[PDB]
Amino acid sequence: GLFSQKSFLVLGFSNENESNIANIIKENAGKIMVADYAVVPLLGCEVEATVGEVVTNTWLVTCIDYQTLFDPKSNPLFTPVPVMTGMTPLEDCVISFSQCAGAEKESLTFLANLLGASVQEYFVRKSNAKKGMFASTHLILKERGGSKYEAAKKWNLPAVTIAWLLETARTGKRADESHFLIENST
Amino acid sequence: GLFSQKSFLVLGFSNENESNIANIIKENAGKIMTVADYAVVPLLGCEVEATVGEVVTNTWLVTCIDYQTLFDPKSNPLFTPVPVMTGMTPLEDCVISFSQCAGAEKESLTFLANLLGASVQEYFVRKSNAKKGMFASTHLILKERGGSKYEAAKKWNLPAVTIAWLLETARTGKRADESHFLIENS
């Protein structure tokens, strides 16, 4: 199995949610209970007991979706994400994603909503009431490339990195888009 | 600069076209011409008697610039001259849509498909609609298993093929067996 000889500890989830995670771990050959991992919510919770390392269910679900065991340090959603709660810095924003799929995208969309943005599947230049699309204010992505990125450049709309989202999240303050343009990412 | 420490020959274009291309290379820190790193040639290619590191296409040049990345010319068959069996039109009754392709790569595939006698359509529809000005589609050309159009082709029983199908058609002068290039087998 993938989680062969790996012990886990699920923390901070609901009565049911704990069980679903515990299930999917055994279903890929891990053991439940010093533990190799401690699975906690995206926003992290109370971890008293000493573990190998604290990872998120986002890491977990991602790992299984690729059948690969990723390093938790290789993506900031894989470990608990700092958020300044109570803040809605993204209040008036309408966000699209590009180059993000599955669990990662569910999590980013989670954080975006948390900050009070609205998220849409479609990157949209002009609001169309009949179609149900509101004009987008931000594109969030990973590399330069693809049709969403090309529309952002053509429409003069900020196409920023994921770190823009996570920094706003950390400080509860809207990150300066110009400091996070994918246009300038190396 | 992106093309910094790189030297270029610009061969095969009209006077006005190569002036533009040369300026673009210069604007990206490249030098125009010893042995040049690159000879930029049109997609279909041209005589290059000078000796250069490698011969590359305008599609390479533009993509590279669009994504501010120095892609290895071997990473995409459109980056180096594409062999076409001249004057042959084996796709004369085809109506082709592309999925998952953007920008210069897409402008180039479009050119090729038209060149082979195909007609290229923005919208993938199963049935012609004269009022809307759209023709029934016959092929979908895409990069990976997934997305709206891919599902539609599966539903409509239309062939969904990798780009290699298109290029193999061009090289031979003959319509390649769609069943040897299905997206399901890649």
Binding site: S98, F123, K126 | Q100, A102, G146
Partner: peptide
């Protein structure tokens, strides 16, 4: 990006 998802 399996879908283009670009509008206007």
């Amino acid at each position: 990006d399996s879908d283009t998802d670009v509008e206007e």
